[model samples]
Target: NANFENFIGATEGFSEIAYQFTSHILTLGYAVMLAGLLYFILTIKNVDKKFQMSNILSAVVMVSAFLLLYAQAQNWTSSFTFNEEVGRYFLDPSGDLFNNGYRYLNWLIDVPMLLFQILFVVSLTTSKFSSVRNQFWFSGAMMIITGYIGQFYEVSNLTAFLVWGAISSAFFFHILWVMKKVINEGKEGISPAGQKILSNIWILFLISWTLYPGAYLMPYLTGVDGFLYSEDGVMARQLVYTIADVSSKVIYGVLLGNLAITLSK
Candidate 1:
């Protein structure tokens, strides 16, 4: 029966395959803005070009490095908590125990959860744009503290989503401001060099912002198979998956592909 559930759930069999998919998807998205920024930098040998690339690279490096660590955490947790419980609920749905092993893997999952919560917030905090850097840092700090409190309480779902949304708003606003500022500045009949500089910045911010929201509240949706997308809610589940695909994966690919084109010079 559990094996049947595992087969039905679509997350079972081959943890390695899952990890690889995650890695590839995330890398594709990150690489888009990365390639764009890199090409924008390499196209011009000016002093400003160097500075722009370096600044953008800082953010890229932070995001990439954090993901690497986060991925390691997931892989480790999966291995350490290997069992039918882990398989059915977290890994493979058909394995049995209806994801009962999730309880045993909670400690492992929680550790990475904490690590990632910090890393994502930190990625935004380290952004060079000043429009909201100070405020963002403060919000991010509150988020980290909130996450810590949740860890203590053991039922931190509420805290997690709340803080996640807050941080997300700050990041969205920051990216918007950066892109807007560059555009508005360029409108003053700025020099071609300056205009082009701002243009590239515009591209970076737009691409970065597009990918930003995808990181919001994913783990929270994990139980949707029970509460939200149940056997009785087939239509609702399909619709939700459609929306999710557009918002998460499809847009991701679109943004990344555009970024890659811009980067290819």
Candidate 2:
């Protein structure tokens, strides 16, 4: 860490509690996703046939998230060496390194399916459906890719991070703007209860999904070596991210898939 001391990042060592805290949270992260995966697989048939696609997408996300988190947890455990003198787990100085890139890559896999799953239940014109779907696809991907590019510079280069972040925000805002329209328009022919569920899902999507950007912005907002990029900061960030991931993927899937059953009746 001192080697790259100019840039903002976590310290080189984690105390026993700090290291184990993050390790436990990461385990919790993956375990929840794995559980979500099982729920998707077991209850696949309970949902109506049309909405089953959402459950399938959820299953894909759960599995991918489970693996990603599991890998991240392993990276945490291995990336550090125990420091007897300091009584902490010191990051392997100039070692293999732990990368958060896995999070972005996981987003790349989930974002498209997350957007498309709604289409399985929402009533939309064939023409309008794919058109908006394309926007969601492109925008969600660009958001992740742009943010990915930005994180490398998150600490050292202010301009690159802000610029890339702005580009990513634009895509995110576009997704929100268009998705709002989609949700409102999607209400056609749905029952009152189903319509309310659609609206609530959008609401959940709006609130929970914002955490992604917040997570991305944390280091910058906290300033170099501030609350983020510290030992506890690392753990806090993971906990926040896990909540967002579970909420968006697992709970969102359950709600929407149930809506599909509601409509099927």
Candidate 3:
């Protein structure tokens, strides 16, 4: 329904399209490596057992995250597959809509995004993963069911945003609580890797949660384009939003990278 601007779509070497595609690929690779590490943690003898979740949450998180990786991979595939039509004229939507392709990929990723969203919160809430498999499964089921109910009524943007926003907000505060509890209790001493993983994840959730509220103003802010809003207005808004997104994500990356060092012992 909403297409990003045409000029913004092109912009030669830099574009949201390029960034999304590239970021998707990068996230995919990271997800794969993380999944592999998860497997190793589950099976390997030397690793700390406390880091492991029960098979169900472990399966759900792995599958959901991997699905996100697949969703990203599909973008690369779509780019290659439609090199002539879609890729060449990706910037131009006068003929056909790129939003359709983007949404299709987004829809694939969205379901998993919701899945892992819940799992992340649930996992953080229950330190003993085995004790809470039913909660994990029930919460996950309710998320999908509620989403379907909303979709059935043609409530796309509003419903989808509300659902995601609710789950994300839940996770955001839940993680904060979990992290604080972990820090205060000082029990079990989750692997630095675990702390790192949770910290990175916490920042990601924070950025996304904040970004959702900011996005609500995009229309009122950008409605006039260069006239009332001015190029400066748009640029300023874009600059602030982009910097916030990049800074938050980069901070997460630093936490995650340090995790390796912290957990090495």
Candidate 4:
């Protein structure tokens, strides 16, 4: 039977251990502030009803994220959650195995919500909301599900990983295309300051999110025997993901909240 194990148990290499240390700290940070942030959003005086609701939903996303990350951290850092096949596969090229599944499961919920948070903020001062709203959810769902399939479908194959990644990237680009349209249309509705805020938010998202796929492909990008798939690679991947999560969700949420509050006035 597959069982959980601690970060230390997984591998003692410096890269992997460092990755585990940072990831645990980052996960805790991810969990700790959610309620307070949610409260701040909810309590803004005279905020637009729609904006308030959108931010509240964003808060809910964070709350759910905190729950998932907290649970994942337990397994990631100190639990015995391992599959013999997964362990053997990653640890020994000659063996066939697959890792645990919590990482993708977390993404299943969080990715859609991440897009929703942005959509709501972008819609705050827009005209003809339905089109953008629909695009947001659809594109977000496509991006995440495809990415999930690629990652877990065949954990050991580079070709499968890259192919799924390409499909997922297409959906992600589609979301960016939709956002461009939103920004163009929204120029008239939002203030100069508001436009600047949204613009920054857009760039921030692009920069942080673009790194995700690179991290995903790190193992394949290097030789199959490369550092990325090694114990060090595992740690690096985790660190990369945790950093992206903090930026994409936490910073994104706070900035969007600020934009919403500003637009509310």
Tens digits of per-residue lDDT, candidate 4, 1-265, equal 1211222234432334454574566576556546535664556544666766656666676776677766666544443333454332122223222244555666667676676655565553444677777777887788888887777543456577679989999988988887777766655678888888888887888888887887676545567555555555555666777777777777777777778877877
lDDT of candidate model 1 versus the reference: 0.36
TM-score of 2: 0.91
For candidate 2, give the lDDT of residue 253.
Answer: 91
Predict model 2's lDDT versus the native. Answer: 0.80
lDDT tens readout by residue for model 2, 1-265: 1222112123556778877887788898899999999999999998777678888888999989999888878877877767788687766755556777677789999999999888887887434877988999999999999988887776567788889989999999999998788888778777999988988899889988998888667555677646665665566667778889888898899888878888888
Candidate number with greatest lDDT:
2
User: What is the TM-score (0 to 1) of candidate 4?
Assistant: 0.77
**Which residue ranges in model 4 land beyond 4 Å of their true spot?**
1-16, 19-23, 32-46, 79-100, 123-127
Predictions: Cα RMSD each: 10.7, 2.7, 8.6, 5.5
Q: How many clashes in each candidate?
A: 12, 0, 0, 12
Candidate 4 — worst ten consecutive residues by lDDT sum?
1-10
lDDT of 1 by residue, 136-215 (tens): 44443454444333333222355555565665466446535643643554335445554454455455445543432332
* Off by more than 4 A, model 1: 1-20, 23-156, 167-171, 186-189, 192-200, 218-265
Candidate 2: residue pairs that collide:
none
lDDT of 3 by residue, 29-66 (tens): 43653564365344434323332222223334345444
State each model's CA lDDT, in order. Answer: 0.36, 0.80, 0.39, 0.63
Error of 2 at 134 (Å): 0.8
